[PDB]
Symmetry: D2
Subunit: 295 residues, 4 copies
């Protein structure tokens, strides 16, 4: 027996940072959850009880706090690249740093039409995330994403024409609820290192906003032939809007809302064109995935 | 041994209802989770195996769907009163109906500055709830609430002057983060029955909006001496704004964000006036409650 | 406006305690989550910003750790009474202490037929809880409970004879799955104070074990006419077995497992006597409650 | 733009199956949650709105129920291989089926020392899982696992000798609590198809039991130099015990339990050799991973 792969570090490190403008008196808060895992020459810590190779997970935690102290935490793609670069430069035997970041919403409150200088509201469980792999010799791989974006449309969604055989009971439809929690990931072209990540900084926030925007507009406007067909159009657009992205990936649950037949009761009419009252279903759910790259 | 109290029914009934305007083409969706429990002359179902007294929980579920079909589901205080009244009028041996409703956010999407006719976004995990107790002979008791309203302010919160003794380690402060998940309940004056609940319908949505509004403004503007002092001012205002409310109750966790001392590292300065980076704490948390009524 | 009720304290305080026998070398661990809320003369902290009346929630937390250090943490009814008594004796203006405790399972591991001296396994998410209200002048009220005890029987459960009307679609049955998560609470006769709670210590662990035992045996052996009928027999027995209990309360979800009709497929036979494959339902669920006291 | 990868199917399909012995009168229940995703020639459903290529997720759900009806559901490695093989044989354009299965514990109850014929208890949230990839032309890849196995030892764990630098604050120790939730995956040698999976059936249950056994014994007996060192010995043993396994992978959180210093209070002694009372920490946690293969 031998160690084929190994990684270790600190998960679930919650970090909050405040920015205080002295001019405006305006405060901006950033909250995130950070995971850093390291790889490198650390087999002996497993095979020989040699702790001498271990940057302790506690230190990794200390380091996240220190790096957040000395650097901007925004955009997360940058903070993650700084944090991961720190570890492979600092430690000779550490050859890869994987950093994962979840950003939590703290939206400035509007009190009486005006932006409050220092109060915020978690206006959704939507997250913005990054996965940053900083690998000695191979640059910086970044996947950014939004997740937990939950939407529904009450009509303009259809599903007909699908395979029918002796396993099929589903009826074709031309009018249905479509509801999903959107998970969208866009993978950046590999960057050569931190200087190159710094050089693209403005693209991160912007591409995020664009992926959100496009996601929301296509979902609302597409008269959807299927989840498959709708997510492809989203991914197609993000790719067209940002040349530094190599692939867009979507993962979409189909959260079913079933018609409830009420005709057994006083011939009550609640199906088809008469459907007003539905039973949202907790499970099962369709799960539909697509990776879209450049042709 | 004897039955001192008994109640039974259906919990976690998820209900979605769409309203379709033919004029505008505009759709409005309502999603909620409903719980109905009944009391009455049902001891024998427990003591004697006499199922003859049981309106089956499955039927209760059917009834929720039927009532949502025939009536408005909005405001929840009304839907709950209709649903609970239905059971005590329908069944001679059923003397109390308790209805609980959680309303889930489906906010109309804005696509390109304009309200989309049929697409929605779950723009927060904030809930609006009601508890409705419909009791034969005693009218209708209604408690409405908002919960899951998560907010933070980065400054303008203080906590000093508290008792100090040999259990105390906490340092007084004049500048701190205050963060909480707001739970606010307002209890209506007892209503004589459905006609009276119908007669106050416009007050429900409005008092809800007012409780949200006041909650948000006081949190943002109060320079808070304590959570205790801040929630009292909220409750005081809701009571002043709506005469049909007998009591306002608040339940506020204090979600602590700890300073991280970084001076052990290169004399890094991250405490007091220098605090930029904090560790949000998952637990423990202060829990602070207040019921405010009329003097 | 005035303060009608107020309570404040520390929730979600996780506590672990190890007992080390020097004789045997045997270790015993206890893990729990503790909530303490205080009431008393604390209105001014709300109405006047007077923090002088506040035992800080941070201190309450310190105190839980100190009391766990100086006293046994087992049985929880005792630890809770000590902790709550501490607060009303220590502080003149504090007149009620409410202590809630959740005990988490750490079951000694069996390695090769033998009890391991210092390794444990969380062998279930079942909890043992107490609620202790220590009120100046009124003694100590204790409710103990078990919760999260999830069970299923594949047969010997029935449900027929229930009310049928134009809301009913449910078919009577003589053979069904019954599954539930058991919540059982037994309320002790009021105790005059700590000395009296100390005097009954051996009854706490024993009555707990008896409530678990009885719950499990009745569920397995009763050929159940209904959840209602089954839980009453459980409660009836606990009351008979322990004279110091005034009431037993049960709260039982009915977690439905639906037959799946497969006859549309090659006339596959999966209903009634042929039912092998079922669809466990996440929601809705029947919820059934009973409080049983002495006749 | 083009589709680089695509998969779609049904997630969260809950399935229960009862086995009824007529001889013994003994019932055995199996509950699981199943996910099936398909790949193949389905790009057009995304790019062209061509639903003609879609085996509807609803049908996939129907099929899971049908296959559970006609086949054993145990061991999960077999059921998963049957289910995935079904899809690639049934449908010409479907070239890969991925099946994921979570098995939930339903442990036969012991009533009065004897195994009850038809009552069960969810005696832990521990899961047994499989991931089965059935790929046209490439056989059947199976990864089996156990997860959610939560354990603690109060002593016989150490952590000293680790790297120290200006990011380090952690103190070396020779006595600590070690607690983790075990995730252990063993990957089988690729099988040529269903006949070959059928031919190894008895190895599945047995290797599972062995991985559980070894996990528990090593955790309890190893005087652990580090999580790293402890998990390697587990993985080393599983590999030695079962020749059909190519790799064992472990993923172990380190759930920290912090000493609480109580000497500020009446010089109370609760650290080092005196530590009795600890604060279990919800987050952050060390996360430690290892893949072990054959040298
Ligand atoms: O077992 C451990 N391994 C580690 O890598 C580590 N880092 N801090 N504590 C630790 N404990
Ligand atoms: O045991 C039951 N009690 C009930 O009240 C009920 N209603 N539907 N199924 C039921 N089962
Ligand atoms: O607002 C607060 N109220 C309290 O009672 C308290 N106790 N510690 N910190 C606190 N903050
Ligand atoms: O959009 C959909 N795609 C699918 O593949 C499917 N299967 N059932 N319903 C469905 N809806």
């Amino acid at each position: 027996s031998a160690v084929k792969a190994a990684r270790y570090g600190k998960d679930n490190v919650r970090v909050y940072k405040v920015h205080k403008d002295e001019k405006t008196g305006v405060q901006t808060v950033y909250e995130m959850t950070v995971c850093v895992l390291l790889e490198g020459e650390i087999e002996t810590s497993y095979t020989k009880a040699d702790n001498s190779v271990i940057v302790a997970t506690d230190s990794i935690k200390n380091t996240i706090y220190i790096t957040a102290k000395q650097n901007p935490v925004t955009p997360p793609e940058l903070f993650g690249s700084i944090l991961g670069t720190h570890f492979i430069e600092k430690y000779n035997h550490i050859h890869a740093a994987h950093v994962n970041i979840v950003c939590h919403r703290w939206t400035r409150m509007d009190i009486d039409g005006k932006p409050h200088p220092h109060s915020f509201i978690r206006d959704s469980e939507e997250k913005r995330n990054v996965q940053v792999d900083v690998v000695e010799g191979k640059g910086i791989d970044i996947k950014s994403s939004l997740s937990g974006l939950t939407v529904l449309k009450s009509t303009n969604s259809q599903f007909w024409g699908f395979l029918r055989d002796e396993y099929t009971t589903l009826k074709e439809t031309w009018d249905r609820i479509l509801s999903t929690d959107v998970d969208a990931t866009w993978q950046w072209k590999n960057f050569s290192g931190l200087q190159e990540v710094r050089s693209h900084v403005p693209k991160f926030d912007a591409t995020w906003a664009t992926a959100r925007e496009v996601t929301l507009k296509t979902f609302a406007e597409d008269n959807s032939a299927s989840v498959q067909a709708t997510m492809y159009k989203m991914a197609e657009q993000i790719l067209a809007r940002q040349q530094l992205i190599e692939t867009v990936e979507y993962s979409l649950p189909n959260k079913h809302y079933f018609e409830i037949d009420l005709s057994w009761h006083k011939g009550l009419q609640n199906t088809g064109k008469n459907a007003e009252v539905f039973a949202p279903q907790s499970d099962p759910n369709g799960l539909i995935k697509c990776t879209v790259g450049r042709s």
